[PDB]
Design a protein around this motif. Sequence first.
Motif, short mmCIF file in Angstrom:
data_model
loop_
_atom_site.label_atom_id
_atom_site.label_comp_id
_atom_site.label_asym_id
_atom_site.label_seq_id
_atom_site.Cartn_x
_atom_site.Cartn_y
_atom_site.Cartn_z
N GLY A 16 33.74 39.13 36.34
CA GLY A 16 34.93 39.90 36.66
C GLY A 16 35.79 39.23 37.72
O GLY A 16 37.03 39.26 37.64
N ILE A 17 35.16 38.62 38.72
CA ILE A 17 35.91 37.91 39.75
C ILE A 17 36.53 36.64 39.18
O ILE A 17 37.70 36.33 39.45
N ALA A 18 35.77 35.89 38.38
CA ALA A 18 36.31 34.69 37.76
C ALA A 18 37.42 35.03 36.77
O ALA A 18 38.31 34.20 36.53
N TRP A 19 37.39 36.23 36.19
CA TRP A 19 38.49 36.67 35.34
C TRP A 19 39.76 36.90 36.14
O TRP A 19 40.85 36.50 35.73
N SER A 20 39.63 37.55 37.30
CA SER A 20 40.80 37.90 38.10
C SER A 20 41.37 36.70 38.85
O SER A 20 42.59 36.62 39.04
N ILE A 21 40.53 35.77 39.29
CA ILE A 21 40.96 34.66 40.12
C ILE A 21 41.12 33.38 39.30
O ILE A 21 42.11 32.66 39.48
N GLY A 22 40.18 33.08 38.42
CA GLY A 22 40.21 31.82 37.69
C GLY A 22 40.62 31.92 36.24
O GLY A 22 40.58 30.91 35.52
N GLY A 23 41.01 33.11 35.79
CA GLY A 23 41.44 33.26 34.42
C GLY A 23 40.35 33.07 33.38
O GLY A 23 40.66 32.81 32.22
N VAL A 24 39.08 33.18 33.78
CA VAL A 24 37.98 33.05 32.84
C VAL A 24 38.02 34.22 31.87
O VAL A 24 38.20 35.37 32.27
N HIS A 25 37.85 33.92 30.57
CA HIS A 25 38.00 34.91 29.50
C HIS A 25 39.39 35.54 29.50
O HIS A 25 39.55 36.71 29.16
N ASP A 26 40.39 34.75 29.90
CA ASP A 26 41.78 35.20 29.94
C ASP A 26 42.66 34.07 29.44
O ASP A 26 42.18 33.01 29.03
N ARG A 27 43.97 34.30 29.47
CA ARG A 27 44.95 33.32 29.04
C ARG A 27 45.98 33.10 30.14
O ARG A 27 45.99 33.80 31.16
N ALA A 28 46.84 32.11 29.93
CA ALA A 28 47.89 31.81 30.89
C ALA A 28 49.04 32.80 30.77
O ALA A 28 49.25 33.43 29.73
N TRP A 29 49.78 32.95 31.86
CA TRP A 29 50.90 33.88 31.93
C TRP A 29 52.07 33.17 32.60
O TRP A 29 52.07 31.94 32.76
N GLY A 30 53.08 33.94 32.99
CA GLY A 30 54.29 33.36 33.55
C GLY A 30 54.01 32.57 34.82
O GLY A 30 53.14 32.93 35.62
N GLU A 31 54.76 31.49 34.99
CA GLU A 31 54.57 30.61 36.14
C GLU A 31 55.12 31.26 37.41
O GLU A 31 56.27 31.72 37.44
N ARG A 32 54.29 31.31 38.45
CA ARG A 32 54.66 31.88 39.73
C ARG A 32 54.20 30.96 40.85
O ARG A 32 53.49 29.97 40.62
N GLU A 33 54.61 31.29 42.07
CA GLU A 33 54.14 30.57 43.24
C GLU A 33 52.71 31.00 43.58
O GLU A 33 52.25 32.07 43.18
N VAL A 34 52.01 30.12 44.30
CA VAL A 34 50.66 30.38 44.80
C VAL A 34 49.69 30.59 43.65
O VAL A 34 48.80 29.77 43.41
N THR A 35 49.85 31.70 42.92
CA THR A 35 48.92 32.04 41.85
C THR A 35 49.14 31.21 40.59
O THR A 35 48.24 31.13 39.75
N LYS B 148 38.72 29.76 49.13
CA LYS B 148 38.55 30.85 50.09
C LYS B 148 38.71 32.21 49.42
O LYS B 148 38.01 33.16 49.76
N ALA B 149 39.64 32.31 48.47
CA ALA B 149 39.82 33.56 47.73
C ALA B 149 38.56 33.91 46.95
O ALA B 149 38.13 35.07 46.94
N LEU B 150 37.97 32.93 46.27
CA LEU B 150 36.71 33.16 45.57
C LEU B 150 35.60 33.51 46.55
O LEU B 150 34.76 34.37 46.28
#
Length: 456
Positions: free
Chosen positions: A412-431, A388-390
Amino acid sequence: PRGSHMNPKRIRALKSGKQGDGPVVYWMSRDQRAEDNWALLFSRAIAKEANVPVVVVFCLTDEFLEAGIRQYEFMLKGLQELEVSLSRKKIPSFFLRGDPGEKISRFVKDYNAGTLVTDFSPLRIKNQWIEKVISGISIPFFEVDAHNVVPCWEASQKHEYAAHTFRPKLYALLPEFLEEFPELEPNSVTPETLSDVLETGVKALLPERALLKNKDPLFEPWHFEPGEKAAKKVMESFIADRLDSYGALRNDPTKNMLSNLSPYLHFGQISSQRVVLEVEKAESNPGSKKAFLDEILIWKEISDNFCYYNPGYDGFESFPSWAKESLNAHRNDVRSHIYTLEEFEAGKTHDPLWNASQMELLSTGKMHGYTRMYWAKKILEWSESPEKALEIAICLNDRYELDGRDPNGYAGIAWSIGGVHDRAWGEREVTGKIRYMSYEGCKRKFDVKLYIEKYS
DNA sequence: CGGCTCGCGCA
DNA sequence: TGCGCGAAGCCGAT
Ligand SMILES: Cc1cc2nc3c(=O)[nH]c(=O)nc-3n(C[C@H](O)[C@H](O)[C@H](O)COP(=O)(O)OP(=O)(O)OC[C@H]3O[C@@H](n4cnc5c(N)ncnc54)[C@H](O)[C@@H]3O)c2cc1C
């Protein structure tokens, strides 16, 4: 196919066959410009070698019913100016309406076309139109990448995981493909109404217009003058007045420090290669020049690479394995807030920063590059599910952005939502492990009060 | 193994 | 504001 200042690697054959005795037909779709257009330059060279004229055909589809007036009016005015520009070069522009798969094929037979040329784009709907045309025509069919400096199929032969893997490949091919543009030579052999298609299209898009409480429209159309001539003036002002401070005020939405070229770059009213050329020869800040060149070269063209090698570029499946596993495990996490599409569209969230970002999108049709991350990442944090967010992020982006329905958007949307062309970060809820951004993080980077007060 | 396009504590 | 660090998974140069 002949040519001295013409790199053959910019063209590729879509369908072989005997060259007809008719003029060369350029199916202009993505690069709507006369100058600095490889797809038009290549179409003129083939026409010159065969002693035939060159014509331009544009097919207006029902795709405008999905967008609003802001994109229809911006694109139609550019074509009216484009009609006069090609008329001065003795090149006639023929405007069709309907499905390109049947309108172009019927055009080829009716006009007795000898060769067909179109511009490149990795969107799904264009690969479909091309194949329907291939099955209905019998002349050669070529495709030119007039949008990217390096052709998309030449820069990389696979989906690039990150930019640091795509950066050395692109910069290694720059000395070959970064070249000047030869002038467009008018035709030697000479051989509906756009004003009617504009009035007809606007009347159909009137009920879907974004309005205020007093039935006053939200879109302000005076921020960006459309057309090829106005796109050039935006480039000149950016280099003369805005290139120096680009590297330092890039992420400050309170400052108008961006180039404001995406509405023109999307519709093809301006060539990114021409922008790169003028920037390279300008004497400015070196961190600013490097920061801008990475945006218009590495990241604009890796978005085409993303869509070309991932057919589900607007889906959850295109996300990397680490992202999908992370977002799947947090599906049952309780969310702080749940907003539907209508609450996101009208800007009725608890966050004044998010609402201000949507207000700029609704009023000017172009939200600041930095706030677009917070706008999309908070949708994921305040939605039912990642799907739904996508769905919501793509819907609002393609409806109100003046640069929507673009590969830069889906990447750009897949980068912000799905981490495409990005890396992992700190573990959080939901996201989960997706890159997190907070309202407090924006408070330390720029004046959030000014940005909120600017857009209510 | 090194380095990737956030938040956070600290001058 | 500008900088160094933390938290994280993986490419790709070998
Ligand atoms: C969630 C999200 C959605 C986006 N939606 C779109 C969209 O629909 N259409 C669109 O054109 N851009 C989109 N982008 C990219 C970016 O937001 C815009 O390209 C930029 O804000 C346009 O303003 P500008 O041209 O003044 O930026 P400038 O700073 O002047 O950038 C110059 C050019 O560089 C390119 N560019 C800059 N940033 C990016 C980027 N992150 N990714 C790809 N290319 C980039 C664009 O071609 C842009 O015109 C989106 C980014 C995100 C994170």
